[PDB]
Design a binder for these strands. Structure first.
Ligand SMILES: *[C@@H]1O[C@H](CO)[C@H](O)[C@H](O)[C@H]1NC(C)=O
Ligand SMILES: *[C@@H]1O[C@H](CO)[C@H](O)[C@H](O)[C@H]1NC(C)=O
Lengths: 253, 253
DNA sequence: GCGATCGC
DNA sequence: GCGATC
DNA sequence: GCGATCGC
DNA sequence: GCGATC
């Protein structure tokens, strides 16, 4: 099973209405069984509708989805969108963590997976606020505890664009982040990875796993950023038109 | 007499050490009798030394100067530098306004001018904080009153990079700015001027005059931004390497 | 400092 | 058009 | 979100 | 290397 987290810069009607752009997004999305799409700025779900239409052109149930409400303290809101192949996994339950620790309160989905060692697991999504990256990543530790009590599940994948490097999270701040220091979690995407399509070299996008079953289901060395620029022979300009971030992915067995 | 205010993006040792860059700065500076240079990030005055050396290669007294101390609340400091031709004008007095209304407290120079209608006038320099543009421009009204009481002088020129347009000062904020609403002042650079070398079209840099004598000394239509890119046949890249702003200038008679 | 979209 | 973001 | 220098 | 800016 292939899972990815993808920050698609300002995913909305404008990008989904460009046929060239749409085609590349569709291509990327089709690589995965489960894909978290962040930065969905689509109050009426018109862009999301268009995407599913493309994905479901040959079989109406190729992909299904779960979408959060528009999240944000002020006028700037984003949804978390989970795309999944219904023949591979099912959604057992979902929940919106709500506390005010986060700009975009984490969306949590409990999945059933027939084809892998782990049979049931949750995914916690987070597109952190660049400005409050340290505190938010640190707050995810409490979300993990929450999920654990709510569903009696230890097998949890924490994923998204954490802004977890470069100017947002410096080297001296790591020690104050419980999600990082705790031995309960395994960070699949290392600090040395480059998850940006831009000129920077930053490990913004992360994949964090907790639980013995989930940890043992991970295929060694499968976790990495997917450089779509290199894969598809695009120019930097074309790559940036799709997104400023690369998806981060992992394979489960 | 020709007076200008020029924000030279990060004026410092790096820019002054590039001979091509230095040459263009020198060319620009030589157009004027009095020139306010902002964004001087030169704690030891090495860049300022180099500039004067160029300017004074043929006659040791071609240009003289007055420099403020490094100004700023925190670690980011800038000096205000006034370059003047000593055969044209003299410095009678200077003063550092100090209150905490400003990020970079205005430097004030009182000049003597033999060749023009106005014989004595002050120049108030301000490189406002982009973020607190409205309040700072509004605070200049109080500085004007200050100068007026200190020296019994009504002939005052307020100049610099006020960040007075586009996202920093919007249309609905103008009415709260006393320097703008008061009939005491004449705004020489209009809102329709473009003072940036970048792609934006903004009237950031301004020239404001108070006092009857000074107002009547102004040559009608002489006040404008000096587009050095167009003047010297530079590429956009070369122009931006010099500065992101154009000098604003005026002629007095 | 810059540039972009959304959602009014 | 422009504010709140990334 | 990005990129630049200074001044440690 | 990195924080405080523009
Ligand atoms: C799609 O976006 C790209 C990359 O930004 C193009 O430049 C193209 O202009 C857009 N769409 C067109 C009209 O088909
Ligand atoms: C001067 O700066 C320019 C413009 O940015 C050049 O690209 C040039 O590389 C610099 N100086 C050189 C070494 O002489």
């Amino acid at each position: 099973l292939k899972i990815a987290a993808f920050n698609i810069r300002t995913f909305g009607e404008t990008k989904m209405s460009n046929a060239t752009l749409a085609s590349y997004i569709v291509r990327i999305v089709r690589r995965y069984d489960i894909v978290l799409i962040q930065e969905v700025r689509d109050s009426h779900l018109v862009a999301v509708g268009k995407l599913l239409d493309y994905l479901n052109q040959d079989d109406p149930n190729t992909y299904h989805y779960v979408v959060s409400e528009p999240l944000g303290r002020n006028s700037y809101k984003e949804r978390y969108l989970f795309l999944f192949r219904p023949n591979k996994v099912s959604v057992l339950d979902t929940y919106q963590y709500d506390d005010d620790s986060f700009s975009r309160e984490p969306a949590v989905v409990k999945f059933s997976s027939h084809s892998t060692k782990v049979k049931e697991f949750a995914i916690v999504a987070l597109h952190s606020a660049p400005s409050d990256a340290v505190a938010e990543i640190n707050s995810l530790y409490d979300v993990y505890l929450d999920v654990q009590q709510k569903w009696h599940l230890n097998d949890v994948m924490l994923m998204g664009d954490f802004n977890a490097d470069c100017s947002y999270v410096t080297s001296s701040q790591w020690s104050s982040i419980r999600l990082r220091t705790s031995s309960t979690f395994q960070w699949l995407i290392p600090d040395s990875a480059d998850t940006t399509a831009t000129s920077t070299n930053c490990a913004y996008d992360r994949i964090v796993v907790a639980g013995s079953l989930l940890q043992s289901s991970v295929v060694p060395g499968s976790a990495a950023p997917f450089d779509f620029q290199a894969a598809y022979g695009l120019s930097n300009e074309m790559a940036l038109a799709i997104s400023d971030h690369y998806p981060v992915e992992v394979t489960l067995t």
